[PDB]
Design a protein around this ligand. Structure first.
Ligand SMILES: O=C(O)c1ccc(OCc2ccccc2)cc1
Length: 284
């Protein structure tokens, strides 16, 4: 079926939970043996969210190459994404090592450091120009260059230096700051505006390594971001945009990381975002 009318048909029939459970039943199951080794326990935030072995990002280190991060490679859309958990106190150096080694231009953050009165990820970037951060375990230096605070999101320019070689690179930090502590946003308009700002920066384009996107577990909000982006790109590429099937795209993405889209409300919100976004790309 088309998307917008499938949407109203699920609303009128109130069957979002049943649709979402079908997706959960049909989703791929692949091994995640490296994630579960005892030496990696303090590298995982949640015991039930792990990267598959076949798609995990490897650190370029011989001691321990493990990080909780996955490469989502979308062949028809010609887009790749790295989805990862919010960094932990003992993985902030690994996180920036990955950004460096994978040649990423941008980092997309979809959570606040504290939500619901608890810490959802480490404070992993510097908050003042004159107070830079050094990660001694991976030999990297990180400096805040500039910061632009808007009503729904903040963009930061950061300088990452590899202290072994003295090479430097400019990284863009795109921080969506207004996702509610509970539920999903009422309108997708600010989330879509944010996606378009990431696109306009070059961070999603083939001349760079894959964008790094995270929330707390790296599957829920993060899944919503890449699902909406890929669906909108396919609607632009194909002769028949009504052939784009958001449930089939989501199942393709779940071949590369488990659990993408965590609730039926996140699934409904993803439909809403793609539907409204497709009108702006052209005009209604
Ligand atoms: O009739 C439909 O079922 C439909 C028609 C057009 C359409 O395209 C939306 C779009 C998105 C992004 C760029 C250009 C067009 C999607 C679905």
């Amino acid at each position: 079926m088309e998307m917008e009318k499938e949407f109203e048909q699920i609303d009128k029939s109130g069957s979002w939970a049943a649709i979402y459970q079908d997706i959960r039943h049909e989703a791929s199951d692949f091994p995640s043996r490296v994630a579960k080794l005892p030496k990696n326990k303090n590298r995982n935030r949640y015991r039930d969210v792990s990267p598959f072995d076949h798609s995990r990002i490897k650190l370029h280190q011989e001691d321990n190459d493990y990080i909780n991060a996955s490469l989502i490679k979308m062949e028809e859309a010609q887009r790749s994404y790295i989805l990862t958990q919010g960094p932990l106190p003992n993985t902030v150096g690994h996180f920036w090592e990955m950004v460096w080694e994978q040649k990423s231009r941008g980092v997309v953050m979809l959570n606040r450091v504290m939500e619901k009165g608890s810490l959802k990820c480490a404070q992993y970037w510097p908050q003042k120009e004159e107070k830079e951060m050094i990660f001694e375990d991976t030999n990297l230096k990180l400096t805040l260059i500039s910061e632009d605070i808007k009503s729904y999101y903040t963009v930061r320019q950061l300088e990452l230096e590899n202290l072994t070689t003295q090479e430097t690179r400019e990284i863009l930090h795109f921080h969506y700051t207004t996702w509610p502590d509970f539920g999903v946003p009422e309108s997708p308009a600010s989330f879509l505006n944010f996606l378009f700002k990431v696109r306009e920066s070059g961070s999603l384009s083939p001349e760079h390594g894959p964008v790094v996107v995270h929330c707390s577990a790296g599957i829920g909000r993060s899944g919503t971001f890449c699902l909406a982006d890929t669906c909108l790109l396919l609607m632009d590429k194909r002769k028949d945009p009504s052939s784009v099937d958001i449930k089939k795209v989501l199942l393709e993405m779940r071949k590369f990381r488990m659990g993408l889209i965590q609730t039926a409300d996140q699934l409904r919100f993803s439909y809403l975002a793609v539907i409204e976004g497709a009108k702006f790309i052209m005009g209604d």
